[PDB]
Enzyme design. Structure first.
Site, short mmCIF file in Angstrom:
data_model
loop_
_atom_site.label_atom_id
_atom_site.label_comp_id
_atom_site.label_asym_id
_atom_site.label_seq_id
_atom_site.Cartn_x
_atom_site.Cartn_y
_atom_site.Cartn_z
N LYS A 7 0.88 -1.18 0.00
CA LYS A 7 0.00 0.00 0.00
C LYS A 7 0.93 1.24 0.00
O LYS A 7 0.64 2.15 -0.78
CB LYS A 7 -0.90 -0.07 1.23
CG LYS A 7 -1.85 1.21 1.13
CD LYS A 7 -2.94 1.20 2.20
CE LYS A 7 -3.85 2.38 1.91
NZ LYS A 7 -5.15 2.23 2.55
N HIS A 12 2.62 6.14 -2.32
CA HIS A 12 3.78 7.08 -2.25
C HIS A 12 5.03 6.88 -3.12
O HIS A 12 5.94 7.69 -3.02
CB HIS A 12 4.21 7.10 -0.81
CG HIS A 12 3.08 7.48 0.13
ND1 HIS A 12 2.50 8.62 0.20
CD2 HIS A 12 2.46 6.72 1.08
CE1 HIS A 12 1.58 8.58 1.13
NE2 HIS A 12 1.54 7.41 1.69
N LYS A 41 -4.90 -3.05 -22.76
CA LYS A 41 -5.52 -2.75 -24.09
C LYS A 41 -4.33 -2.40 -25.03
O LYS A 41 -3.53 -1.56 -24.67
CB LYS A 41 -6.45 -1.58 -23.87
CG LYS A 41 -7.16 -1.23 -25.19
CD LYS A 41 -8.47 -0.48 -24.71
CE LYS A 41 -9.61 -0.49 -25.76
NZ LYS A 41 -9.62 0.80 -26.55
N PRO A 42 -4.19 -3.01 -26.16
CA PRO A 42 -2.98 -2.85 -26.99
C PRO A 42 -2.73 -1.45 -27.56
O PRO A 42 -1.61 -0.99 -27.58
CB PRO A 42 -3.18 -3.96 -28.07
CG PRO A 42 -4.67 -4.03 -28.22
CD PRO A 42 -5.19 -3.93 -26.75
N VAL A 43 -3.79 -0.85 -28.03
CA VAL A 43 -3.76 0.50 -28.64
C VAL A 43 -4.98 1.35 -28.23
O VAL A 43 -6.06 0.81 -28.10
CB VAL A 43 -3.77 0.35 -30.17
CG1 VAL A 43 -3.86 1.71 -30.82
CG2 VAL A 43 -2.52 -0.27 -30.70
N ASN A 44 -4.80 2.63 -28.04
CA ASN A 44 -5.92 3.52 -27.67
C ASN A 44 -5.54 4.99 -27.98
O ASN A 44 -4.41 5.32 -27.72
CB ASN A 44 -6.20 3.40 -26.19
CG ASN A 44 -7.44 4.23 -25.91
OD1 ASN A 44 -8.49 3.97 -26.46
ND2 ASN A 44 -7.45 5.22 -25.09
N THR A 45 -6.49 5.76 -28.46
CA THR A 45 -6.28 7.20 -28.81
C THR A 45 -7.11 8.17 -27.93
O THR A 45 -8.29 7.95 -27.76
CB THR A 45 -6.69 7.44 -30.24
OG1 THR A 45 -5.83 6.61 -31.00
CG2 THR A 45 -6.26 8.83 -30.73
N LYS A 66 -13.90 0.62 -40.81
CA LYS A 66 -12.97 -0.49 -41.11
C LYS A 66 -13.69 -1.82 -41.29
O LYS A 66 -13.33 -2.64 -42.12
CB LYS A 66 -11.99 -0.54 -39.95
CG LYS A 66 -10.80 0.42 -40.10
CD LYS A 66 -10.23 0.47 -38.69
CE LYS A 66 -8.78 0.92 -38.69
NZ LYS A 66 -8.33 0.98 -37.25
N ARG A 85 0.31 3.17 -27.50
CA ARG A 85 0.49 1.79 -28.09
C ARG A 85 1.36 0.99 -27.16
O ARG A 85 2.34 1.50 -26.69
CB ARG A 85 1.17 1.91 -29.46
CG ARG A 85 0.36 2.82 -30.39
CD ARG A 85 1.00 2.80 -31.78
NE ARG A 85 0.15 3.61 -32.73
CZ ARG A 85 0.59 4.75 -33.24
NH1 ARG A 85 1.55 5.45 -32.68
NH2 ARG A 85 0.04 5.18 -34.35
N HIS A 119 -17.69 4.89 -30.91
CA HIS A 119 -16.39 4.13 -31.14
C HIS A 119 -15.32 5.01 -31.88
O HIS A 119 -15.69 5.83 -32.71
CB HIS A 119 -16.68 2.87 -32.00
CG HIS A 119 -17.55 1.83 -31.32
ND1 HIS A 119 -17.32 1.24 -30.20
CD2 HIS A 119 -18.76 1.34 -31.76
CE1 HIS A 119 -18.31 0.43 -29.94
NE2 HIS A 119 -19.22 0.47 -30.89
N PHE A 120 -14.07 4.83 -31.60
CA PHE A 120 -12.99 5.62 -32.28
C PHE A 120 -12.49 4.56 -33.34
O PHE A 120 -11.97 3.50 -33.04
CB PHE A 120 -11.91 5.98 -31.25
CG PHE A 120 -10.85 6.82 -31.99
CD1 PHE A 120 -9.87 6.20 -32.75
CD2 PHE A 120 -10.89 8.18 -31.91
CE1 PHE A 120 -8.94 6.97 -33.43
CE2 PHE A 120 -9.97 8.95 -32.59
CZ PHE A 120 -8.99 8.33 -33.35
N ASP A 121 -12.67 4.87 -34.59
CA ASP A 121 -12.26 3.93 -35.66
C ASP A 121 -10.84 3.99 -36.21
O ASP A 121 -10.23 2.94 -36.38
CB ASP A 121 -13.26 4.12 -36.86
CG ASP A 121 -13.34 2.86 -37.76
OD1 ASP A 121 -13.61 1.84 -37.17
OD2 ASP A 121 -13.15 2.95 -38.96
#
Lengths: 124, 124
Positions: A7, A12, A41-45, A66, A85, A119-121
């Site tokens: 913890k 800290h 999560k492998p990829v995210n924007t 897509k 990424r 959704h972000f495509d």
């Protein structure tokens, strides 16, 4: 039951020489926004524009998504976005991400009534 | 439950903030390290030294704790830390923190066997 020593580490400790560097943004945001729960999560924007502006994309250029659906829309202007990424040696529960700051047009899937981004495509 | 629109805001929206913004470090860290879960912790300090260095304080200067506890030790040297304090405008579920970086001596409460840091007491 996390031990008291674990913890203390969690609450800290953040060992490093440039803790607020822009390169650590994705590691910290993916964690904060719960995208590393039970898996990385492998990829995210992330889009740094105002919600009103991203919502207006649902009434701009209609494009094919897509996956072949046609309820995707491209922004007429470029937007400030950050691509996160996974780094090659990233493995749950130690997710690691590379932060990339670009300026591109975004393509989102819009749903509901009124139509809003669901959704972000892709970015282009 | 979380609607599809809400899920998109959580995964992709970070309006008015940038990866280069070092003043947003406490907002990212307090969230990621689960200190805004159900309430907003008021104050917290992150230590940027290696864990070995912080663990060593339990065998350095024995001192009286400043925050109602016992078994406190002070580091012989100053350490790079970050103080996070809620902004007067902070109210769960919208916690907000002010970020300050400084170099001070830390006082930790040690416990267990081997004796390790179990509580952050104060910075002096």
């Amino acid at each position: 039951k996390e031990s008291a020593a674990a913890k203390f580490e969690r609450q800290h400790m953040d060992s490093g020489n440039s803790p607020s560097s822009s390169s650590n943004y994705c590691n910290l945001m993916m964690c904060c926004r719960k995208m590393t729960q039970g898996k990385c999560k492998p990829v995210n924007t992330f889009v740094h524009e105002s919600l009103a502006d991203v919502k207006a994309v649902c009434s701009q250029k209609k494009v094919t998504c897509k996956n072949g659906q046609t309820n995707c829309y491209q922004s007429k202007s470029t937007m400030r976005i950050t691509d996160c990424r996974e780094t090659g040696s990233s493995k749950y529960p130690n997710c690691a991400y590379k932060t990339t700051q670009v300026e591109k047009h975004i393509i989102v899937a819009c749903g509901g009534k009124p139509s809003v981004p669901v959704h972000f495509d892709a970015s282009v």
